[PDB]
mmCIF file of C-alpha atoms and ligand atoms in Angstrom:
data_model
loop_
_atom_site.group_PDB
_atom_site.id
_atom_site.type_symbol
_atom_site.label_atom_id
_atom_site.label_comp_id
_atom_site.label_asym_id
_atom_site.label_seq_id
_atom_site.Cartn_x
_atom_site.Cartn_y
_atom_site.Cartn_z
ATOM 1 C CA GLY A 263 69.458 45.085 -12.710
ATOM 2 C CA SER A 264 71.729 46.451 -15.260
ATOM 3 C CA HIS A 265 69.705 49.874 -16.134
ATOM 4 C CA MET A 266 70.909 51.766 -13.189
ATOM 5 C CA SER A 267 74.672 52.908 -12.522
ATOM 6 C CA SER A 268 76.894 50.398 -10.457
ATOM 7 C CA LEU A 269 77.401 50.895 -6.995
ATOM 8 C CA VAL A 270 80.643 50.450 -5.925
ATOM 9 C CA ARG A 271 80.133 46.934 -3.643
ATOM 10 C CA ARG A 272 83.747 45.883 -1.061
ATOM 11 C CA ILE A 273 84.062 43.561 1.577
ATOM 12 C CA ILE A 274 86.292 45.033 4.280
ATOM 13 C CA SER A 275 89.095 42.694 5.077
ATOM 14 C CA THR A 276 92.152 43.506 7.983
ATOM 15 C CA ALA A 277 94.478 41.299 9.247
ATOM 16 C CA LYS A 278 94.642 44.128 12.205
ATOM 17 C CA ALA A 279 91.180 42.871 13.102
ATOM 18 C CA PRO A 280 89.881 39.711 13.945
ATOM 19 C CA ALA A 281 89.185 36.347 12.186
ATOM 20 C CA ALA A 282 85.857 36.270 11.637
ATOM 21 C CA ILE A 283 84.365 33.056 13.346
ATOM 22 C CA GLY A 284 80.581 32.478 11.593
ATOM 23 C CA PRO A 285 79.964 33.299 7.463
ATOM 24 C CA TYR A 286 80.769 37.443 7.580
ATOM 25 C CA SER A 287 82.754 40.083 6.213
ATOM 26 C CA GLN A 288 83.916 42.026 8.560
ATOM 27 C CA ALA A 289 82.591 45.022 6.505
ATOM 28 C CA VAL A 290 80.748 45.801 3.310
ATOM 29 C CA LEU A 291 81.440 49.165 2.043
ATOM 30 C CA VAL A 292 78.259 49.667 -0.579
ATOM 31 C CA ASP A 293 78.190 52.619 -2.174
ATOM 32 C CA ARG A 294 79.344 55.286 0.317
ATOM 33 C CA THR A 295 78.036 53.365 3.634
ATOM 34 C CA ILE A 296 80.232 50.821 5.652
ATOM 35 C CA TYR A 297 78.326 48.965 7.279
ATOM 36 C CA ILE A 298 80.768 46.963 9.807
ATOM 37 C CA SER A 299 79.973 44.032 11.486
ATOM 38 C CA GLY A 300 79.459 43.723 15.851
ATOM 39 C CA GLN A 301 83.137 43.879 17.411
ATOM 40 C CA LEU A 302 83.595 42.211 20.320
ATOM 41 C CA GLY A 303 86.675 42.953 22.223
ATOM 42 C CA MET A 304 88.801 40.549 20.921
ATOM 43 C CA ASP A 305 92.533 40.623 20.645
ATOM 44 C CA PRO A 306 93.112 40.595 16.544
ATOM 45 C CA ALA A 307 96.148 38.082 17.201
ATOM 46 C CA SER A 308 95.172 35.213 19.194
ATOM 47 C CA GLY A 309 90.711 35.167 18.624
ATOM 48 C CA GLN A 310 90.360 35.075 22.681
ATOM 49 C CA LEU A 311 88.439 38.219 24.167
ATOM 50 C CA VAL A 312 91.631 40.195 26.412
ATOM 51 C CA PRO A 313 91.536 40.053 30.164
ATOM 52 C CA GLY A 314 90.249 42.836 32.301
ATOM 53 C CA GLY A 315 86.724 42.426 32.078
ATOM 54 C CA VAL A 316 83.999 45.414 30.115
ATOM 55 C CA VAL A 317 86.246 48.255 30.116
ATOM 56 C CA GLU A 318 89.238 46.491 28.567
ATOM 57 C CA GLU A 319 86.783 44.394 26.183
ATOM 58 C CA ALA A 320 85.014 48.462 25.099
ATOM 59 C CA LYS A 321 88.673 49.401 24.256
ATOM 60 C CA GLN A 322 89.779 46.750 22.580
ATOM 61 C CA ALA A 323 86.004 46.600 20.309
ATOM 62 C CA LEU A 324 86.416 50.004 19.534
ATOM 63 C CA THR A 325 90.697 49.768 18.845
ATOM 64 C CA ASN A 326 88.719 46.951 16.405
ATOM 65 C CA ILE A 327 86.274 49.029 14.600
ATOM 66 C CA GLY A 328 89.154 51.858 14.185
ATOM 67 C CA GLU A 329 91.748 49.164 11.944
ATOM 68 C CA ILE A 330 88.384 48.348 10.057
ATOM 69 C CA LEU A 331 87.687 52.011 9.430
ATOM 70 C CA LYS A 332 90.912 53.115 8.062
ATOM 71 C CA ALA A 333 90.541 49.706 5.539
ATOM 72 C CA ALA A 334 88.178 51.607 4.768
ATOM 73 C CA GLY A 335 89.709 54.510 4.072
ATOM 74 C CA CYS A 336 87.715 56.433 7.015
ATOM 75 C CA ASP A 337 88.355 57.217 10.660
ATOM 76 C CA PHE A 338 85.815 57.096 13.552
ATOM 77 C CA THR A 339 84.497 60.583 12.221
ATOM 78 C CA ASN A 340 83.490 58.893 9.619
ATOM 79 C CA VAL A 341 81.003 56.923 11.628
ATOM 80 C CA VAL A 342 77.474 58.243 11.937
ATOM 81 C CA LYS A 343 75.174 55.628 14.064
ATOM 82 C CA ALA A 344 76.969 52.838 16.607
ATOM 83 C CA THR A 345 75.055 50.812 19.030
ATOM 84 C CA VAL A 346 76.165 48.522 22.092
ATOM 85 C CA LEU A 347 75.346 45.380 23.186
ATOM 86 C CA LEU A 348 76.346 45.466 27.050
ATOM 87 C CA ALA A 349 76.293 42.540 29.040
ATOM 88 C CA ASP A 350 75.063 44.128 31.854
ATOM 89 C CA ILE A 351 73.294 47.807 31.823
ATOM 90 C CA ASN A 352 75.235 49.003 35.208
ATOM 91 C CA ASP A 353 78.267 48.699 32.671
ATOM 92 C CA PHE A 354 76.370 52.085 31.013
ATOM 93 C CA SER A 355 78.452 54.492 32.239
ATOM 94 C CA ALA A 356 81.630 52.995 31.882
ATOM 95 C CA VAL A 357 81.796 52.048 28.753
ATOM 96 C CA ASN A 358 80.344 55.409 27.921
ATOM 97 C CA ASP A 359 83.444 56.316 29.236
ATOM 98 C CA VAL A 360 85.480 54.465 26.724
ATOM 99 C CA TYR A 361 83.340 55.374 24.048
ATOM 100 C CA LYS A 362 83.914 58.945 24.387
ATOM 101 C CA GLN A 363 87.644 59.175 24.054
ATOM 102 C CA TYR A 364 87.216 57.460 20.099
ATOM 103 C CA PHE A 365 84.019 59.531 19.082
ATOM 104 C CA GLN A 366 85.535 63.045 20.210
ATOM 105 C CA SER A 367 83.067 65.499 18.167
ATOM 106 C CA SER A 368 80.225 64.947 15.533
ATOM 107 C CA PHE A 369 78.933 62.037 17.808
ATOM 108 C CA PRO A 370 77.339 59.290 16.081
ATOM 109 C CA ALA A 371 73.735 58.492 16.962
ATOM 110 C CA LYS A 372 73.407 56.222 19.279
ATOM 111 C CA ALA A 373 71.384 52.593 21.286
ATOM 112 C CA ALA A 374 72.791 51.519 24.014
ATOM 113 C CA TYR A 375 70.838 48.422 25.866
ATOM 114 C CA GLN A 376 71.461 45.083 28.326
ATOM 115 C CA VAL A 377 71.140 42.065 25.641
ATOM 116 C CA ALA A 378 70.813 38.219 27.219
ATOM 117 C CA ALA A 379 74.369 37.134 26.162
ATOM 118 C CA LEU A 380 76.985 37.316 23.924
ATOM 119 C CA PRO A 381 79.348 35.325 21.386
ATOM 120 C CA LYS A 382 82.480 33.844 23.499
ATOM 121 C CA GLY A 383 80.459 35.361 26.873
ATOM 122 C CA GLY A 384 81.260 39.206 25.905
ATOM 123 C CA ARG A 385 80.507 42.177 28.354
ATOM 124 C CA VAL A 386 80.377 43.889 25.630
ATOM 125 C CA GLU A 387 79.665 44.183 21.789
ATOM 126 C CA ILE A 388 80.133 47.406 19.422
ATOM 127 C CA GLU A 389 78.630 47.726 15.461
ATOM 128 C CA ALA A 390 78.809 50.826 13.577
ATOM 129 C CA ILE A 391 77.592 52.579 10.422
ATOM 130 C CA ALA A 392 80.098 55.179 8.648
ATOM 131 C CA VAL A 393 80.172 57.323 5.225
ATOM 132 C CA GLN A 394 83.014 57.355 2.983
ATOM 133 C CA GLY A 395 83.847 61.773 2.929
ATOM 134 C CA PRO A 396 84.109 64.282 2.227
ATOM 135 C CA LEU A 397 81.392 65.134 4.332
ATOM 136 C CA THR A 398 80.922 68.834 4.537
ATOM 137 C CA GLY B 209 60.519 68.570 0.376
ATOM 138 C CA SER B 210 60.514 69.600 -3.523
ATOM 139 C CA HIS B 211 63.688 71.090 -4.185
ATOM 140 C CA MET B 212 65.675 67.957 -4.705
ATOM 141 C CA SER B 213 65.299 64.605 -6.431
ATOM 142 C CA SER B 214 62.021 62.475 -5.498
ATOM 143 C CA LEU B 215 63.417 59.064 -4.735
ATOM 144 C CA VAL B 216 61.830 55.759 -5.458
ATOM 145 C CA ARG B 217 59.863 54.536 -1.735
ATOM 146 C CA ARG B 218 58.145 51.463 -2.610
ATOM 147 C CA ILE B 219 56.085 49.200 -0.242
ATOM 148 C CA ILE B 220 57.835 45.623 -0.318
ATOM 149 C CA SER B 221 54.269 42.826 0.272
ATOM 150 C CA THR B 222 54.256 39.124 -1.496
ATOM 151 C CA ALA B 223 51.426 36.432 -0.320
ATOM 152 C CA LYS B 224 54.666 33.729 -0.656
ATOM 153 C CA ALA B 225 56.076 35.583 3.137
ATOM 154 C CA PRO B 226 53.839 35.587 6.750
ATOM 155 C CA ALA B 227 51.019 38.439 6.595
ATOM 156 C CA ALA B 228 52.292 40.839 9.181
ATOM 157 C CA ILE B 229 51.083 40.754 13.234
ATOM 158 C CA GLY B 230 51.743 44.148 13.514
ATOM 159 C CA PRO B 231 51.616 47.899 11.587
ATOM 160 C CA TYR B 232 54.440 47.215 9.557
ATOM 161 C CA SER B 233 55.392 46.891 6.124
ATOM 162 C CA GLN B 234 58.231 43.222 5.415
ATOM 163 C CA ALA B 235 60.114 45.797 3.124
ATOM 164 C CA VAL B 236 60.287 49.213 2.125
ATOM 165 C CA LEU B 237 62.956 50.309 -0.946
ATOM 166 C CA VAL B 238 64.050 53.776 -0.379
ATOM 167 C CA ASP B 239 66.214 55.131 -3.244
ATOM 168 C CA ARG B 240 67.853 51.908 -3.647
ATOM 169 C CA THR B 241 68.696 51.006 -0.289
ATOM 170 C CA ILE B 242 65.454 47.436 1.388
ATOM 171 C CA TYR B 243 65.040 47.806 4.834
ATOM 172 C CA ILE B 244 63.662 43.791 5.771
ATOM 173 C CA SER B 245 61.753 43.282 8.941
ATOM 174 C CA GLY B 246 62.693 40.580 11.338
ATOM 175 C CA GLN B 247 61.871 37.403 10.077
ATOM 176 C CA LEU B 248 60.449 34.765 11.802
ATOM 177 C CA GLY B 249 60.526 31.075 11.392
ATOM 178 C CA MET B 250 56.718 31.419 10.531
ATOM 179 C CA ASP B 251 55.174 29.253 7.736
ATOM 180 C CA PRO B 252 53.999 31.596 4.977
ATOM 181 C CA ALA B 253 50.802 29.959 4.654
ATOM 182 C CA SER B 254 49.488 29.688 8.674
ATOM 183 C CA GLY B 255 51.505 32.275 10.130
ATOM 184 C CA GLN B 256 52.889 29.919 12.700
ATOM 185 C CA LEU B 257 56.292 28.917 13.423
ATOM 186 C CA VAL B 258 57.391 25.759 11.228
ATOM 187 C CA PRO B 259 58.249 22.823 13.699
ATOM 188 C CA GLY B 260 61.146 20.992 14.444
ATOM 189 C CA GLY B 261 63.152 23.924 17.191
ATOM 190 C CA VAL B 262 66.207 26.233 16.139
ATOM 191 C CA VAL B 263 66.986 24.370 12.901
ATOM 192 C CA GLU B 264 64.145 24.577 10.857
ATOM 193 C CA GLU B 265 63.133 27.869 12.390
ATOM 194 C CA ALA B 266 66.145 29.617 10.594
ATOM 195 C CA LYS B 267 65.502 27.710 7.595
ATOM 196 C CA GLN B 268 62.194 28.540 7.756
ATOM 197 C CA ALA B 269 63.257 32.915 8.548
ATOM 198 C CA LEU B 270 65.238 33.007 5.493
ATOM 199 C CA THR B 271 63.336 31.513 3.027
ATOM 200 C CA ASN B 272 60.662 33.943 3.770
ATOM 201 C CA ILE B 273 64.101 36.756 3.412
ATOM 202 C CA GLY B 274 64.323 35.430 -0.009
ATOM 203 C CA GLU B 275 61.071 35.722 -1.360
ATOM 204 C CA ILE B 276 60.706 39.201 -0.150
ATOM 205 C CA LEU B 277 64.007 40.129 -1.616
ATOM 206 C CA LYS B 278 62.812 38.737 -5.001
ATOM 207 C CA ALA B 279 59.417 40.458 -4.730
ATOM 208 C CA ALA B 280 62.241 43.354 -4.597
ATOM 209 C CA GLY B 281 64.175 42.377 -8.058
ATOM 210 C CA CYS B 282 67.211 40.984 -5.482
ATOM 211 C CA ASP B 283 68.451 38.242 -4.707
ATOM 212 C CA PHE B 284 70.606 37.145 -1.372
ATOM 213 C CA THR B 285 73.997 38.524 -3.091
ATOM 214 C CA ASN B 286 72.259 41.920 -2.624
ATOM 215 C CA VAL B 287 71.558 41.895 1.032
ATOM 216 C CA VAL B 288 74.808 44.098 2.520
ATOM 217 C CA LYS B 289 74.012 43.049 6.158
ATOM 218 C CA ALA B 290 72.182 40.889 8.954
ATOM 219 C CA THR B 291 71.335 40.833 11.773
ATOM 220 C CA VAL B 292 69.929 37.427 13.889
ATOM 221 C CA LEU B 293 68.199 37.145 17.533
ATOM 222 C CA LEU B 294 69.282 34.319 19.046
ATOM 223 C CA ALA B 295 66.588 32.639 22.420
ATOM 224 C CA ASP B 296 70.206 30.708 22.552
ATOM 225 C CA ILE B 297 73.761 31.455 22.179
ATOM 226 C CA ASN B 298 74.113 28.666 22.336
ATOM 227 C CA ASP B 299 72.387 28.251 18.901
ATOM 228 C CA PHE B 300 74.812 30.026 17.311
ATOM 229 C CA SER B 301 77.229 27.512 16.121
ATOM 230 C CA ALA B 302 73.895 25.522 13.884
ATOM 231 C CA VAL B 303 72.141 28.900 12.498
ATOM 232 C CA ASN B 304 75.444 29.835 11.138
ATOM 233 C CA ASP B 305 75.717 26.243 9.695
ATOM 234 C CA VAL B 306 71.658 26.798 7.909
ATOM 235 C CA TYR B 307 72.913 30.564 7.499
ATOM 236 C CA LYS B 308 75.639 29.922 5.175
ATOM 237 C CA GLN B 309 74.277 28.413 2.721
ATOM 238 C CA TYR B 310 71.987 30.597 2.002
ATOM 239 C CA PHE B 311 74.574 33.696 1.736
ATOM 240 C CA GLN B 312 77.333 31.710 -0.038
ATOM 241 C CA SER B 313 79.519 34.728 -1.491
ATOM 242 C CA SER B 314 80.707 38.885 -0.594
ATOM 243 C CA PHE B 315 79.271 37.725 2.921
ATOM 244 C CA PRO B 316 76.950 40.581 4.406
ATOM 245 C CA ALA B 317 78.105 41.981 7.671
ATOM 246 C CA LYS B 318 76.923 40.799 10.895
ATOM 247 C CA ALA B 319 75.441 40.654 14.142
ATOM 248 C CA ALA B 320 74.091 37.954 15.957
ATOM 249 C CA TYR B 321 73.165 37.851 20.070
ATOM 250 C CA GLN B 322 70.392 35.855 22.063
ATOM 251 C CA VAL B 323 67.736 38.434 23.324
ATOM 252 C CA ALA B 324 65.793 37.948 26.297
ATOM 253 C CA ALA B 325 62.324 37.051 24.117
ATOM 254 C CA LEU B 326 61.160 36.845 20.476
ATOM 255 C CA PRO B 327 57.584 37.196 19.173
ATOM 256 C CA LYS B 328 55.521 34.215 19.475
ATOM 257 C CA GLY B 329 58.394 32.643 21.974
ATOM 258 C CA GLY B 330 60.345 32.035 18.484
ATOM 259 C CA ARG B 331 64.106 30.584 19.241
ATOM 260 C CA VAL B 332 65.371 33.354 15.907
ATOM 261 C CA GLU B 333 64.631 36.288 14.107
ATOM 262 C CA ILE B 334 66.954 37.562 11.163
ATOM 263 C CA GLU B 335 66.894 41.022 10.248
ATOM 264 C CA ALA B 336 68.948 42.622 6.422
ATOM 265 C CA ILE B 337 69.287 45.227 4.228
ATOM 266 C CA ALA B 338 70.241 44.890 0.494
ATOM 267 C CA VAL B 339 71.069 47.020 -1.825
ATOM 268 C CA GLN B 340 69.917 46.482 -5.534
ATOM 269 C CA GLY B 341 71.743 45.979 -8.341
ATOM 270 C CA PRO B 342 73.857 46.574 -10.642
ATOM 271 C CA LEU B 343 77.105 46.171 -7.779
ATOM 272 C CA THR B 344 80.640 45.995 -9.282
ATOM 273 C CA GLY C 82 88.566 62.123 0.875
ATOM 274 C CA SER C 83 88.228 65.082 -2.169
ATOM 275 C CA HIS C 84 87.874 63.680 -5.039
ATOM 276 C CA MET C 85 83.840 62.694 -4.917
ATOM 277 C CA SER C 86 80.742 65.138 -4.374
ATOM 278 C CA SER C 87 80.999 66.397 -0.019
ATOM 279 C CA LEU C 88 77.451 65.411 1.697
ATOM 280 C CA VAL C 89 75.514 67.173 3.752
ATOM 281 C CA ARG C 90 76.639 65.638 7.346
ATOM 282 C CA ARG C 91 74.471 67.815 10.209
ATOM 283 C CA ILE C 92 73.837 67.002 14.008
ATOM 284 C CA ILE C 93 70.215 66.605 14.901
ATOM 285 C CA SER C 94 69.402 68.848 17.996
ATOM 286 C CA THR C 95 65.904 69.914 19.527
ATOM 287 C CA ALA C 96 65.414 71.090 23.175
ATOM 288 C CA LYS C 97 61.851 69.766 22.581
ATOM 289 C CA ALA C 98 63.369 66.337 22.853
ATOM 290 C CA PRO C 99 65.385 65.156 26.086
ATOM 291 C CA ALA C 100 69.182 66.042 26.472
ATOM 292 C CA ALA C 101 71.823 63.380 26.392
ATOM 293 C CA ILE C 102 73.126 61.580 28.968
ATOM 294 C CA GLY C 103 76.217 60.175 27.423
ATOM 295 C CA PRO C 104 78.205 60.836 24.102
ATOM 296 C CA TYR C 105 75.518 60.942 21.066
ATOM 297 C CA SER C 106 74.000 63.201 19.285
ATOM 298 C CA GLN C 107 69.634 63.391 18.837
ATOM 299 C CA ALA C 108 69.863 62.055 15.442
ATOM 300 C CA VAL C 109 72.887 62.655 12.441
ATOM 301 C CA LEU C 110 71.588 63.191 8.913
ATOM 302 C CA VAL C 111 73.976 62.361 6.261
ATOM 303 C CA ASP C 112 72.814 62.910 2.872
ATOM 304 C CA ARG C 113 69.012 62.505 2.546
ATOM 305 C CA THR C 114 69.395 59.498 5.208
ATOM 306 C CA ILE C 115 68.756 60.475 9.620
ATOM 307 C CA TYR C 116 70.077 58.158 12.159
ATOM 308 C CA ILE C 117 67.648 58.539 14.693
ATOM 309 C CA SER C 118 69.314 57.989 18.400
ATOM 310 C CA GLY C 119 66.634 55.006 20.729
ATOM 311 C CA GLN C 120 64.468 57.395 22.413
ATOM 312 C CA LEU C 121 62.891 56.090 26.575
ATOM 313 C CA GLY C 122 59.661 57.248 27.524
ATOM 314 C CA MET C 123 61.603 60.578 28.993
ATOM 315 C CA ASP C 124 59.826 63.499 29.532
ATOM 316 C CA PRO C 125 62.590 65.760 27.926
ATOM 317 C CA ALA C 126 62.440 68.481 30.814
ATOM 318 C CA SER C 127 63.039 66.670 32.723
ATOM 319 C CA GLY C 128 65.166 63.530 31.631
ATOM 320 C CA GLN C 129 62.622 61.315 33.523
ATOM 321 C CA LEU C 130 60.616 58.517 32.678
ATOM 322 C CA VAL C 131 56.531 59.463 32.287
ATOM 323 C CA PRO C 132 54.574 58.134 35.025
ATOM 324 C CA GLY C 133 52.301 55.502 33.992
ATOM 325 C CA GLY C 134 54.330 52.197 32.378
ATOM 326 C CA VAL C 135 54.699 51.429 28.901
ATOM 327 C CA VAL C 136 52.173 52.571 27.251
ATOM 328 C CA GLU C 137 52.655 56.177 28.918
ATOM 329 C CA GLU C 138 56.917 55.635 27.900
ATOM 330 C CA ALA C 139 55.788 54.408 24.501
ATOM 331 C CA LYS C 140 53.417 57.093 23.517
ATOM 332 C CA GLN C 141 56.212 59.773 25.233
ATOM 333 C CA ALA C 142 59.127 58.050 23.012
ATOM 334 C CA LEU C 143 57.652 58.750 19.676
ATOM 335 C CA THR C 144 56.973 62.217 20.607
ATOM 336 C CA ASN C 145 60.461 62.506 21.360
ATOM 337 C CA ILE C 146 60.811 60.394 17.659
ATOM 338 C CA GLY C 147 58.891 63.005 15.931
ATOM 339 C CA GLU C 148 59.971 66.592 17.715
ATOM 340 C CA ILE C 149 63.278 65.425 16.522
ATOM 341 C CA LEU C 150 62.138 64.715 12.848
ATOM 342 C CA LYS C 151 60.310 67.721 12.723
ATOM 343 C CA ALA C 152 64.419 68.842 13.042
ATOM 344 C CA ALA C 153 65.756 67.113 10.230
ATOM 345 C CA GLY C 154 62.457 68.253 7.848
ATOM 346 C CA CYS C 155 60.449 65.494 8.023
ATOM 347 C CA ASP C 156 58.222 63.905 9.445
ATOM 348 C CA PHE C 157 56.370 60.178 10.516
ATOM 349 C CA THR C 158 55.810 59.024 6.698
ATOM 350 C CA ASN C 159 60.088 59.729 5.812
ATOM 351 C CA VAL C 160 60.583 56.432 8.505
ATOM 352 C CA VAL C 161 61.461 53.487 6.991
ATOM 353 C CA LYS C 162 62.636 50.903 9.281
ATOM 354 C CA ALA C 163 62.346 51.093 13.438
ATOM 355 C CA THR C 164 63.684 48.874 15.784
ATOM 356 C CA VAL C 165 61.001 48.898 19.161
ATOM 357 C CA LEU C 166 62.707 47.235 22.568
ATOM 358 C CA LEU C 167 60.872 45.819 25.011
ATOM 359 C CA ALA C 168 61.429 45.018 28.550
ATOM 360 C CA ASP C 169 58.938 42.461 28.426
ATOM 361 C CA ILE C 170 57.270 40.985 25.273
ATOM 362 C CA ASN C 171 53.702 40.509 26.581
ATOM 363 C CA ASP C 172 53.606 44.385 25.948
ATOM 364 C CA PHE C 173 54.128 43.931 22.650
ATOM 365 C CA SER C 174 50.632 44.113 21.516
ATOM 366 C CA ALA C 175 50.160 46.830 23.506
ATOM 367 C CA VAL C 176 52.927 48.911 21.822
ATOM 368 C CA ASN C 177 51.931 48.178 18.752
ATOM 369 C CA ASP C 178 48.343 50.123 19.661
ATOM 370 C CA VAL C 179 50.796 53.023 20.441
ATOM 371 C CA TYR C 180 53.122 52.438 17.528
ATOM 372 C CA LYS C 181 49.727 52.350 15.088
ATOM 373 C CA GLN C 182 48.687 55.835 15.809
ATOM 374 C CA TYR C 183 51.601 57.503 14.371
ATOM 375 C CA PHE C 184 52.760 54.933 11.565
ATOM 376 C CA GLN C 185 49.149 55.476 9.502
ATOM 377 C CA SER C 186 50.575 54.665 6.092
ATOM 378 C CA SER C 187 53.274 53.531 4.171
ATOM 379 C CA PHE C 188 54.356 52.199 7.449
ATOM 380 C CA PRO C 189 57.779 51.781 7.898
ATOM 381 C CA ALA C 190 60.181 47.730 8.095
ATOM 382 C CA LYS C 191 60.092 46.784 11.740
ATOM 383 C CA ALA C 192 61.711 44.809 14.036
ATOM 384 C CA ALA C 193 59.913 44.072 17.801
ATOM 385 C CA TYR C 194 61.352 42.280 20.671
ATOM 386 C CA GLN C 195 62.510 41.818 24.088
ATOM 387 C CA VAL C 196 65.765 42.652 25.488
ATOM 388 C CA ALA C 197 67.377 42.184 28.965
ATOM 389 C CA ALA C 198 67.338 45.406 30.479
ATOM 390 C CA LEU C 199 67.064 49.013 29.030
ATOM 391 C CA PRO C 200 68.747 52.370 30.465
ATOM 392 C CA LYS C 201 67.568 53.972 33.640
ATOM 393 C CA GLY C 202 64.344 50.690 33.823
ATOM 394 C CA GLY C 203 62.471 52.023 30.873
ATOM 395 C CA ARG C 204 59.632 49.525 29.612
ATOM 396 C CA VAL C 205 60.166 50.166 26.178
ATOM 397 C CA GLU C 206 63.106 51.947 23.587
ATOM 398 C CA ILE C 207 62.540 53.081 20.407
ATOM 399 C CA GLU C 208 64.594 53.445 17.079
ATOM 400 C CA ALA C 209 64.505 54.820 13.949
ATOM 401 C CA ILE C 210 65.910 55.478 10.643
ATOM 402 C CA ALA C 211 63.875 58.119 8.127
ATOM 403 C CA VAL C 212 65.186 59.946 4.563
ATOM 404 C CA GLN C 213 64.191 63.541 3.581
ATOM 405 C CA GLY C 214 61.997 64.009 0.731
ATOM 406 C CA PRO C 215 61.024 64.329 -2.016
ATOM 407 C CA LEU C 216 59.251 60.841 -1.875
ATOM 408 C CA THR C 217 57.073 59.971 -5.208
HETATM 409 NI NI1 LIG D 133 68.972 47.645 -14.120
HETATM 410 NI NI1 LIG D 134 62.947 70.156 -1.747
HETATM 411 NI NI1 LIG D 135 88.333 62.297 -2.026
#
């Protein structure tokens, strides 16, 4: 508690991603690992879900993750694991097609499945874990 | 498998948290990272859910997490990521109000959402990841 | 981004586990931590769920995880955290009985609960996190 190295622990916060609607940080950097909170397809300015259903929500959620990554000195190539929570399993393929446009190489490990309900009636919510570079 | 440092890996076990009802440890410390098993609002002495519904269950689950943290040389300030699994999304705000009483600063990254069912008919289950200090 | 050590980041890929059905890697090794994608009870050769329901699916999912671990220089003793996603909470005990045959000591931290639906109509999906040895 004093006998080992003191590791970085930094709260990541950017107005380019939505404000919190509960007692949480957008992301936490600890040592070099970044835990990103689950992101809905929420407009950063209004705090409400973007219109147009699951495809548009997925694009916005991933955009939000990208801005949090950038605030933490990373990009999508630093992501090592993601979780995609769906309101409808039948949206699996369509959300995958959005996802692949952001995660273009060194693809993260992943789980994707249908939950009973998301906050605000979201159709998709995406969590991620990243590691600060350099990565060989 | 012998050419790198041998990292600490320690099973965390305290009678101040409930006994296992399956093949799992309360938590695992590996290097400085602590993975805590999902905690229901179970009374540590009886192994049954405390009465009074989701608010009381959330308080008990977080109390249980606190005792596991303490057994691992940590407190709630060491938590970096939590997951709150709900039986009912409409309980989001009320569980947040309990949660904020324990996680009072450096708030963890978080995801919270409704699943189809929890063991024992629990109304809430909370998982967490912590990192042993010092943290700067 | 150049001022710290360059950590290993390696995509784990083995034909002894099923091919991807989306934009993801079977596992990612980053430093010494291995994030394994969620595994259904899919036959590695055919890419379809094995017959016989949840018990047989759980055995196949864990077999698949074991082959991914082996490709990453690990075995089941390196696992520190697992998540068991069920189509039916009433299968909790039966899946635990399969799980315990693979995870025989130093049991991982765990969460297990029922989701609304899994890809392909799977009855069980298992994710895991491991750390490369040596572990003391
Ligand atoms: Ni110390
Ligand atoms: Ni070695
Ligand atoms: Ni650098």
